[PDB]
Write a protein that binds this ligand. Structure first.
Ligand SMILES: N=C(N)NNC(=O)Nc1c(F)cc(S(=O)(=O)Nc2scnc2C(=O)O)cc1F
Ligand SMILES: [Zn+2]
Ligand SMILES: [Zn+2]
Ligand SMILES: [Zn+2]
Length: 232
């Protein structure tokens, strides 16, 4: 029903069922005096679970595993980090200690290493060129090109028409650019156009942060990125 917001979430994680065998995970971090939520994805893979992204640090990620263990009761066997920043790889060591196989593209592993971030163990091949797609159990992984980061992936759940954009897609309430230090502002709209052209059938679109919507989130993101590009 109601999507969890910061008001409903203290170190804690809430799960939200989007569709059959598909959940978002919602966590929060305090940064620079503000509290910001973050979304990831949980996709049932027969009798196991695939996790998309950490819950933004070690404590949140241990809370995530505890909240999955309580509310779903199926083992997380694999996790994918959609880019090298801490809201995506922070907590990878926690997952690994729990016997989760952690995965990222070689691009993400290299950038995580340069940044001194946690490094997922396993390499995702076949994603190095813009518009590359690879199947990963119950999802398709898609490299749309540089956007929020040079390595960002998006995740589609063909069975449920759920598109998880991670930090490449903004929620409607975000009307100004977020962390764009590692962004390719010049390529971001082209990368969104690749997502639009590949998943024109998506019914649910989950941004990296805040409320889900539909494919209008992609145009929304294009509008915000263009407005930032044109700052005088
Ligand atoms: N906007 C520039 N140029 N660079 N920004 C920064 O160096 N730092 C920074 C920033 F500007 C903005 C944010 S943010 O607004 O909280 N965005 C965040 S926090 C976790 N994920 C994101 C995101 O946008 O996906 C976090 C940051 F660490
Ligand atoms: Zn990021
Ligand atoms: Zn392994
Ligand atoms: Zn982010």
């Amino acid at each position: 029903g109601e999507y969890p917001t910061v008001s409903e979430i203290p170190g804690e994680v809430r799960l939200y069922q989007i569709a059959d065998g598909v959940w978002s995970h919602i966590a929060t971090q305090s940064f620079d005096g503000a509290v910001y939520p973050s979304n990831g994805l949980i996709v049932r893979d027969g009798d196991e679970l695939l996790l998309i992204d950490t819950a933004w640090g070690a404590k949140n990620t241990a809370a995530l595993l505890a909240e999955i263990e309580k509310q779903i009761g199926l083992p997380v066997t694999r996790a994918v980090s959609t880019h090298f920043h801490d809201d995506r790889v922070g907590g990878v060591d926690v997952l690994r200690a729990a016997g989760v196989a952690t995965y990222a593209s070689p691009s993400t592993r290299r950038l995580a290493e340069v940044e001194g971030n946690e490094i997922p163990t396993h390499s995702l091949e076949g994603l190095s060129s813009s518009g590359d797609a690879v199947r990963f159990g119950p999802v398709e992984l898609f490299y749309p090109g540089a956007a929020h980061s040079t390595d960002n992936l998006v995740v589609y759940v063909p069975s449920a028409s759920v598109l998880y954009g991670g930090c490449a897609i903004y929620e409607l309430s975000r009307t100004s650019a977020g962390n764009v230090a590692d962004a390719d502002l010049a390529e971001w709209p082209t990368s969104i156009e690749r997502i639009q052209q590949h998943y024109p059938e998506a019914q649910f679109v989950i941004p990296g942060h805040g409320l889900p919507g539909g494919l209008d989130l992609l145009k929304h993101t294009t509008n915000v990125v263009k407005a930032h590009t044109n700052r005088s």
